């Protein structure tokens, strides 16, 4: 399972 880590 991917993590997909930050947008306003």
């Given at each position: 399972?991917?993590?997909h880590x930050?947008?306003?």
């Open positions: 399972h991917p993590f930050y947008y306003s």
